[PDB]
Amino acid sequence: AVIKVSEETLMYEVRATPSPADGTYVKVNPPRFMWPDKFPHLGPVLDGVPGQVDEKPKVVYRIRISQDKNFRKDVLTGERAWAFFNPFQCLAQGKWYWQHAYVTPEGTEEWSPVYQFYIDKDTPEFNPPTLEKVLARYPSHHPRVLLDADDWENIIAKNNNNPEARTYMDKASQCISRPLKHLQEEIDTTNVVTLTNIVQRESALIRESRKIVDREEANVEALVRAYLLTKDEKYYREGINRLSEILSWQKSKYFAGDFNLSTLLSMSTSAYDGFYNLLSPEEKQLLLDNIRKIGDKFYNEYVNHLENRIADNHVWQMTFRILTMAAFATVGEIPEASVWTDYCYNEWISRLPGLHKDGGWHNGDAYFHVNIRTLIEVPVFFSRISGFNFFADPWYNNNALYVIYQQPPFSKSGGHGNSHEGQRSPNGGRIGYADALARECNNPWAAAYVHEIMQEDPDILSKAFEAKPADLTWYRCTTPKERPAYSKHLSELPESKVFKQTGTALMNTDIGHHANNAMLSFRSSPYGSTSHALANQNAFNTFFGGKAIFYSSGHRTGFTDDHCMYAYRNTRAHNSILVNGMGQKIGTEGYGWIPRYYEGEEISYVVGDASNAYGKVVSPLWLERGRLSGTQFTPEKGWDENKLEFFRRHVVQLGRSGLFVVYDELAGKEPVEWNYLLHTVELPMEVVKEEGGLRILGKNKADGISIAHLYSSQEMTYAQTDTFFVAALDWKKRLGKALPNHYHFTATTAPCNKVFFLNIIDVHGNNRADAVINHQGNHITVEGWVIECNLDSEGKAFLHIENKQNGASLDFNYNSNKGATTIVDQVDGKRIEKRLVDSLP
Ligand SMILES: O=C(O)C1=C[C@H](O)[C@@H](OS(=O)(=O)O)[C@H](O[C@H]2[C@H](O)[C@@H](NS(=O)(=O)O)[C@@H](O)O[C@@H]2COS(=O)(=O)O)O1
Ligand SMILES: [Ca+2]
Ligand SMILES: [Ca+2]
């Protein structure tokens, strides 16, 4: 029942294995074929500072696919400049064989081993049309990307009475005859020049230049759309005026980072497609010169790189969509765009949207939003030009649940990924996204999220959020789809949701009534702590009424700076466990996973395994970032030789009571001191001895309470502090100072090879008084729950929880259950029994 994983990593920064995997049943027909590059390529390690980069040869691959193992009969073949292939047909049922080849510059083939896969009668079909079909019917007229010329007059008429459309003309009109100065006059470099660390200095230059570029992009895009909605050429004249000035900034020493360059490509695409029929020969050459130059630069960066990165952030967020639209804007007009369209259309189909197929966002709460326009605009565009529904990808309906559970109405987000602490309430961008999912997928839960939130806040779409990567106003101006009618209520959702592949879980007592909702989030993820993800495997957070109590601490001050590495990403910042003060490895190697779980009604359950997440940092990507950034991955900073053999954290939701039980199994290869952590981010914790353990009271500045009743198989000492491991200096801001302190509780055990912790957490607000924990009859009772467990370092772990009155129970043991967890639950008046065993992700 208990699976042990012995892998150095579960996910790879750079693809190491073929998909579909050897001997597997594919999850979709046709399969999406992908394989590692002949010359595996990590590429630049940072936006501002590339680091050591290898050559990336142009290459040719081949593929053959057949139910005939000797590849003689009915063989599908392909040749590509990149390591992915789409058959564009549904394959027959049964067993299949395939292999891919690298073709040397001399014409020699290096064939892979022959791999096998199976197609079932049950295998889902998701078969978008060939690019040849799409281009055959693609019109040569402009506009054809921002909208279609045939639909132009209708879109104008429909928006004459759309108050959302008025904002473009208002914003654009402010620009007219209002000169834009040159970059060097608009930019603020007064902070940049004070910085001596090159990663920080270059990062700040990126930030300062993007401030100006992004401000002006909003102007240029408003000018293009104002022209499309009115046909008043004053918007064309100023649009060309303003864009010409921005383009002239190209070669400035201040014009830094790839988003700025992609922004030039994007605006050039909008002005070219939108103003096409008005362009003078010089204006057209200007726009086309820049499309060619910048599109070629990004294609050359992506190819033999993007497709095999675990995820390439700036590309997935904005930059891929931007090449896609530039390619479809100019296909048939410039030769280069044939290659770009081929690449982008196939790469989307190959592996997008998303990384985790359960719908979770790998990079967490904040960065999800930076993908919103990409997640919607690309498949909307592909769908209308192809006549095929790209939203039939099951990821979208799965992602709808992530949107709701990860940040319920008017609620603090669950606490994952860089900048998680700033996500306090669903913003207009998130609402615009759920709105699109509701329309494109006819998803009643997404519809409920939008309807119930707009009921309380009618103006939410117009509130504050970063427009550049997330604003869907233009989508709303141009879609012929209406919002579906409100049907399901959020209150009809399951109390808990587990994302097994993402490695996260959300538990709620009242998700459909946010102000009364006691909530716990959990992470133990195969993605580890690379990219924007944190080193928080087996970490939980708690919330009441949509405000956090026990919560991951620290501030997002950068991407690789000392505060981030030592006090924010670092395991010491989170509600998890340290080993002799040492934390989880930075990178994909610091992974966790969720071996078993149960989403129920009277009881819910999730387990995280972080047994392999600790030790020395070995990720070549993060070792290079560390070298460049001045990071020290040393025992003094929190990383040392691994001592951890086993770490499972069992998390039990006690129905809708607001009570959660957290039970830990820990084993080390030698006696160690175990450090049990809790943090709060508004007010200090209050600690007192309680029976044979500790009571840790957390509270926020509002109604929120979370009380940990913590027991261990060993004697514990404790301490609290207000200080971060290193100051949260906001170095990115002019005269930036230290950001506000948080609060850090640590219980430390006597040295031992094995330890168990029981933590009964009481999460509530003004809805009820604290729960009373009774220590009677050599077990523990609370509100009709009886809780028994092993708190004996020399005994076998077990956890037995039962509410006789509600008919719920959970039994984890290594004796009669043989490592399994058995559940009894009541769902709609029916007794439900489950036996849970481990499964890999
Ligand atoms: O949009 C982002 O993903 C992002 C915005 C910023 O460029 C940067 O954040 S920061 O202000 O804290 O520096 C950060 O960019 C990363 C990016 O995510 C990385 N992509 S990855 O290789 O897939 O992980 C990579 O490009 O490095 C960037 C930072 O470069 S730096 O600014 O020179 O330090 O996140
Ligand atoms: Ca992201
Ligand atoms: Ca995270």
Residue numbers in the entry: 24 to 864
Passage from the reporting paper:
These exoHepases share almost no homology with known Hepases and prefer to digest HP rather than HS chains by sequentially releasing unsaturated disaccharides from their reducing ends. The structure of BIexoHep consists of three domains: an N-terminal small β-sheet domain (Ala24–Asn150) composed of a large loop and a five-stranded β-sheet (β1–β5), a central (α/α)5 barrel domain (Pro151–Glu515) containing 20 α-helices (α1–α20) to form an (α/α)5 incomplete toroid structure, and a C-terminal β-sandwich domain (Leu516–Pro864) containing 23 β-strands and 5 short α-helices that fold into a three-layered β-sheet sandwich structure (α21–α25 and β6–β28). Further structural studies have shown that the active center of the exolytic Hepase is an L-shaped semiopen tunnel with a positively charged entrance and a negatively charged exit, which precisely controls the sequential cleavage of highly negatively charged HP.
To investigate the structural characteristics of the PL15_2 proteins, the crystal structure of BIexoHep with an HP disaccharide product was solved at a resolution of 1.98 Å by preparing a crystal of selenomethionine (SeMet)-labeled BIexoHep in the presence of HP disaccharide products followed by single-wavelength anomalous dispersion (SAD) phasing. In the crystal structures, each asymmetric unit consists of one BIexoHep monomer, an unsaturated disaccharide (ΔUA2S1-4GlcNS6S) or tetrasaccharide (ΔUA1-4GlcNS6S1-4IdoA2S1-4GlcNS6S), and two Ca2+ ions that were confirmed by inductively coupled plasma-mass spectrometry (ICP-MS) analysis. According to the hydrogen-bonding networks, a series of residues, such as Asp70, Ser226, Arg230, Arg233, Arg332, Asn336, His337, Gln340, Tyr390, Ser554, His555, Arg579, Arg648, Lys755, and Arg757, participate in the binding of the disaccharide product (ΔUA2S1-4GlcNS6S) and the tetrasaccharide substrate (ΔUA1-4GlcNS6S1-4IdoA2S1-4GlcNS6S). The negatively charged residues Pro67, Asp70, Pro73, Asp281, Glu234, and Asp335 from the N-terminal small β-sheet and central (α/α)5 barrel domains compose the negatively charged section of the tunnel for quick delivery of the disaccharide product. The mutation of negatively charged Asp residues to uncharged Ala or Asn or positively charged His in the exit tunnel caused a dramatic decrease of enzyme activity, such as the enzyme activities of mutants BIexoHep-P67A, BIexoHep-D70N, BIexoHep-D281A, BIexoHep-D281N and BIexoHep-D281H are reduced by 90%, 98%, 70%, 68%, and 85%, respectively, compared with that of the WT-BIexoHep.
